[PDB]
């Protein structure tokens, strides 16, 4: 029950680490700071009708 | 001789932990607080003849 995953590194320079949980409560686990998904559409494009950048904004 | 089992978590949010026993006496093990079986019939329905909720209690 050991999880092996890559660790942060650079662009062109064994980049693996092992983790095991010792407690029965999920609140005792370490921070899951390895998620990098994001989507700014909710705040940048809240309009109803999709607008194309190339075409005029209105008409 | 390592036991892998799930740990407590929420409804819609690796939820695994490992345990090993180091002592030869079962009294030294950790609390087994992961059992959630219950049956209130012994105290709520101690009658001999089964009574249906829908039908009248008597006659």
């Amino acid at each position: 029950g050991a999880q092996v995953s890559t660790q942060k590194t650079g662009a062109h320079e064994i980049i693996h680490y092992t983790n095991i949980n010792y407690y029965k409560d999920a609140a005792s686990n370490s921070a899951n700071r390895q998620d990098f998904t994001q989507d700014p559409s909710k705040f940048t494009e809240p309009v109803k009708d999709v607008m194309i950048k190339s075409l005029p904004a209105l008409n | 001789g390592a036991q892998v089992s799930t740990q407590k978590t929420g409804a819609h949010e690796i939820i695994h932990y490992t345990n090993i026993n180091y002592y030869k006496d079962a009294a030294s093990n950790s609390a087994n607080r992961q059992d959630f079986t219950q049956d209130p019939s012994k105290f709520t329905e101690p009658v001999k003849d089964v009574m249906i909720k829908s039908l009248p209690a008597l006659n």
């Binding site: - | 009248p56 209690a57 008597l58 006659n59």
Partner: protein, 177 residues
């Protein structure tokens, strides 16, 4: 109450002014004095959060020849508790008819804005009120007592639950026993 046992009996009489209140209480199972020391309040007092529905069962302990009808209503939280039967009827209620079956059950539904409520209830987590009113009145034949009594039973449904184990405040000591 000079006699402690009198606390368990709700008085009733014949020739009752029409549409009178029988009793009224606040729904705080863990804080109100009525539910404080009950078999349920004692359990809740060891916790901080609670949720689920409750059951109130009323049993008529009058004469066999006596008869009557009662209205029992539950009023969700509001700015004012009901003061008349017309106000009370608007909320959840059940019409109780006294007959061969001497007991009726009022199931209090779980209506709340939060998944849980504090045992040390406050204005934010208020729960409402429960009241009982005369529906038709009690009628008895000749040669029977002019008064009767009613008893109430409290328990939890199958969807009840508690959380956050705390230490109860009902028991304390000043010196080592």
């Amino acid at each position: 109450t000079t006699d402690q046992m009198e606390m368990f009996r709700i008085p009733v009489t014949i020739n009752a002014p029409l549409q009178q209140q029988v009793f009224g209480l606040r729904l705080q199972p863990g804080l109100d004095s009525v539910f404080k020391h009950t078999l349920l309040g004692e359990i809740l007092n060891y916790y901080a959060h609670w949720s689920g529905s409750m059951k109130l069962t009323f049993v008529f302990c009058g004469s066999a020849m006596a008869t009557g009808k009662f209205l029992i209503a539950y009023s969700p939280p509001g700015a004012n508790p009901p003061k008349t039967r017309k106000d009370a009827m608007l909320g959840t209620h059940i019409i109780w008819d006294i007959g061969l079956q001497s007991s009726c059950v009022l199931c209090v539904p779980w209506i709340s804005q939060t998944h849980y409520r504090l045992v040390q209830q406050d204005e934010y987590t208020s729960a409402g009120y429960v009241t009982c009113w005369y529906q038709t009145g009690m009628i008895v034949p000749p040669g029977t007592p002019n008064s009767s009594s009613i008893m109430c039973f409290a328990s939890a449904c199958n969807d009840f639950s508690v959380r956050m184990l705390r230490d109860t405040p009902f028991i304390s000591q000043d010196n080592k026993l």
